[PDB]
Amino acid sequence: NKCVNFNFNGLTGTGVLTESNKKFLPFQQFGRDIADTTDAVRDPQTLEILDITPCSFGGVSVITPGTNTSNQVAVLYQGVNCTEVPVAIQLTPTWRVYSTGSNVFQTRAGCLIGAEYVNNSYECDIPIGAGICASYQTQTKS
Amino acid sequence: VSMTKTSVDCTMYICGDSTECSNLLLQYGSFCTQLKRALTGIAVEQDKN
Amino acid sequence: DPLSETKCTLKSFTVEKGIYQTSNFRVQPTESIVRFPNITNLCPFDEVF
Amino acid sequence: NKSWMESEFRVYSSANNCTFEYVSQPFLMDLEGKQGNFKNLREFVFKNIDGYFKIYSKHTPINLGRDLPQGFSALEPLVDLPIGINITRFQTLLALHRSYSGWTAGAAAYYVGYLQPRTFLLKYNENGTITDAVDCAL
Amino acid sequence: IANQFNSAIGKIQDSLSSTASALGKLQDVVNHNAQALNTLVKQLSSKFGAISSVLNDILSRLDKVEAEVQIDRLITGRLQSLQTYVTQQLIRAAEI
Amino acid sequence: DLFLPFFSNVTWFHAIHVSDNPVLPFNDGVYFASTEKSNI
Amino acid sequence: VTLADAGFIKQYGDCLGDIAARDLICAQKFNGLTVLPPLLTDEMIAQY
Numbered sequence A: 001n002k003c004v005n006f007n008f009n010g011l012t013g014t015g016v017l018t019e020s021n022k023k024f025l026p027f028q029q030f031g032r033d034i035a036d037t038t039d040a041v042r043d044p045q046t047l048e049i050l051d052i053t054p055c056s057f058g059g060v061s062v063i064t065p066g067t068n069t070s071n072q073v074a075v076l077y078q079g080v081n082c083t084e085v086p087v088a089i090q091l092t093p094t095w096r097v098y099s100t101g102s103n104v105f106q107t108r109a110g111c112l113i114g115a116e117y118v119n120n121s122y123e124c125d126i127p128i129g130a131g132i133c134a135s136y137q138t139q140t141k142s
Numbered sequence B: 001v002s003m004t005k006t007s008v009d010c011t012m013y014i015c016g017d018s019t020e021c022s023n024l025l026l027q028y029g030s031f032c033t034q035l036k037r038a039l040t041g042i043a044v045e046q047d048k049n
Numbered sequence C: 001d002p003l004s005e006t007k008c009t010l011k012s013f014t015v016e017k018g019i020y021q022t023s024n025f026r027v028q029p030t031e032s033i034v035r036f037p038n039i040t041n042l043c044p045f046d047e048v049f
Numbered sequence D: 001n002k003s004w005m006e007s008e009f010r011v012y013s014s015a016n017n018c019t020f021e022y023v024s025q026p027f028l029m030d031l032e033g034k035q036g037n038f039k040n041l042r043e044f045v046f047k048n049i050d051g052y053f054k055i056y057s058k059h060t061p062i063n064l065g066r067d068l069p070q071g072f073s074a075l076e077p078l079v080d081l082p083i084g085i086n087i088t089r090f091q092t093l094l095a096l097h098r099s100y101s102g103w104t105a106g107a108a109a110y111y112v113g114y115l116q117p118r119t120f121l122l123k124y125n126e127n128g129t130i131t132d133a134v135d136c137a138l
Numbered sequence E: 001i002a003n004q005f006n007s008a009i010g011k012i013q014d015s016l017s018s019t020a021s022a023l024g025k026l027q028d029v030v031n032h033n034a035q036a037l038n039t040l041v042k043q044l045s046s047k048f049g050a051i052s053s054v055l056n057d058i059l060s061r062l063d064k065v066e067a068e069v070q071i072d073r074l075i076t077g078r079l080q081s082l083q084t085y086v087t088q089q090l091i092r093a094a095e096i
Numbered sequence F: 001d002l003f004l005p006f007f008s009n010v011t012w013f014h015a016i017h018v019s020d021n022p023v024l025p026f027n028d029g030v031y032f033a034s035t036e037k038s039n040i
Numbered sequence G: 001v002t003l004a005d006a007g008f009i010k011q012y013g014d015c016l017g018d019i020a021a022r023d024l025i026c027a028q029k030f031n032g033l034t035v036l037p038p039l040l041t042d043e044m045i046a047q048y
């Protein structure tokens, strides 16, 4: 259940390991998918079958007003649940500070961070996906 | 009227997260950004159509 | 910051209003796990050599 | 010796230079429990390829529905023998148990089919057994 | 004229309910976007002349001086596979 | 690979002691199968 | 029209275990092929 540099019988990789429901016959050491990468492995010290899946990842899109208008930006984690970006607290984007969140919002396009959701609709200014759009302005409804 | 908006991370399709393959991929120049750009050009058009 | 990531992705010190693709996030591994069979004894290479 | 044993081996009259030897437990003995006039069809494949002799096999419980059945099954790998020799021909061992110099007359029957270099498409089910196949030249 | 229109639009329910094939012109869009991506993910199994198509076997078995000469075969064929997909998608997108 | 073709001829031998058989070839490989019981 | 992947959230708990062994959409995703949602939902298209 944790991301690791695994090596089984010399087969190095990077992924998370889980108990399989799969039922390898005694002659099988590795299980495989449509890209011929190893999808599952039999643990040679105990003969248990482990599923291998790549550690969690996705695309990241950044939403900005005009840089002359402001430097502040919001970030969209593509296809990702907002229960999972707090687990993405090393990672490839080293600007960890956006994890401070507080205004985290789930779109069906992805988890959206740094933009505050508001009930009153507008014209679409920047398109997010799945009926959402984002814009830079003062709400100041109160 | 439209087709499924698709994006590909070429540095992840081409190289299975290994750094040394990622350093060889830079030898090819901007090809991976052109693929990203062209697929983005299609994906922003589906919402125009 | 994610703005600086888009400035390098566009190769521009000014970015206009919009939404821009950037390099994927990827949870990196915390440790190695090496799993050979716990074989006890050295191979007979020292006879055949 | 108060025992059933091979009192002499007729098969080879000499064994002059022997170069690999083995002992084992597989090669498809029998079913457990038995059933009245029920039987088990035993399948083996023998493949000789660049100095390795490879064996695959399968048990098949089959009823009184004739023989060699038009259903489906697949053979599991059994052994990989590093023998490094030319095979061009073969024979099979009968074992009539000599009951009274006596040699009480046994009878047996078996099927032989030579393999070919061929292309197949194989259907693996959601359990990962091969459950169907098609010969791309039939 | 109302009874004609009301009974004619009634047959649209059946023209859609009874046959499977009525929306074939839209199903074909979905089928082509699926078969193109299913092709693109099978191309990761192609060896392009390398000793393995699995990039971690190359990186398990070889050191840098000849690992890079095997990896570059896979960079070349994979990159061509994307170049084919993006050209095909631009050609379809211009028809849609 | 070397497979047995679908719907191909296989030679069904009966064999008996009574109280004639030439050696068989082994070209490519052999599917060998038996329904015979009692380890005869 | 029996659609394949509308683009909505794939919370990883879906992909691991049984489903990635039979559904290609997860194997696509694990290789960085990504299918995005449209801007206008099928409810907003029906509203227009």
Ligand SMILES: *[C@@H]1O[C@H](CO)[C@@H](O[C@@H]2O[C@H](CO)[C@@H](O[C@H]3O[C@H](CO)[C@@H](O)[C@H](O)[C@@H]3O)[C@H](O)[C@H]2NC(C)=O)[C@H](O)[C@H]1NC(C)=O
Binding pocket: E003, E004
């Ligand atoms: C123009 O075409 C119309 C059909 O497309 C036609 O309407 C149909 O008229 C017939 C009678 O002539 C009706 O038929 C039924 O009439 C009675 C029951 O009401 C029965 O005796 C008959 O067996 C039969 O069931 C149709 O119901 C009627 N259809 C509609 C939708 O109204 C017009 O009569 C045609 N007009 C001219 C001027 O020719």
Ligand SMILES: *[C@@H]1O[C@H](CO)[C@@H](O[C@@H]2O[C@H](CO)[C@@H](O)[C@H](O)[C@H]2NC(C)=O)[C@H](O)[C@H]1NC(C)=O
Binding pocket: A081, A082, A083, A106, G009, G011
């Ligand atoms: C994000 O992931 C969590 C699990 O970590 C999802 O929570 C589950 O949601 C279903 C449906 O509402 C409930 O039946 C479960 O009991 C929830 N489990 C837990 C532990 O909370 C959550 O729904 C996901 N969010 C999205 C948008 O998919």
Ligand SMILES: *[C@@H]1O[C@H](CO)[C@@H](O[C@@H]2O[C@H](CO)[C@@H](O)[C@H](O)[C@H]2NC(C)=O)[C@H](O)[C@H]1NC(C)=O
Binding pocket: D016, D017
């Ligand atoms: C196969 O068997 C024969 C018989 O034992 C071996 O031939 C003997 O070889 C030695 C050494 O050259 C000679 O001293 C004997 O006179 C040979 N005897 C005969 C009857 O030829 C032969 O070497 C064996 N083959 C191998 C590869 O070991």
Ligand SMILES: *[C@@H]1O[C@H](CO)[C@@H](O)[C@H](O)[C@H]1NC(C)=O
Binding pocket: A044, A045, A046, C037, C038, C039
């Ligand atoms: C490795 O050691 C474990 C006990 O820690 C034992 O159960 C297992 O059989 C050993 N592995 C092999 C290959 O015997």
Ligand SMILES: *[C@@H]1O[C@H](CO)[C@@H](O)[C@H](O)[C@H]1NC(C)=O
Binding pocket: A117, A118, A119
């Ligand atoms: C949206 O409106 C509902 C009331 O209909 C309200 O409870 C909710 O707090 C509003 N959303 C936000 C982000 O405040």
Ligand SMILES: *[C@@H]1O[C@H](CO)[C@@H](O)[C@H](O)[C@H]1NC(C)=O
Binding pocket: F009
């Ligand atoms: C099968 O064997 C019979 C002879 O027993 C022969 O007449 C027939 O032509 C053979 N068919 C093929 C396809 O081998």
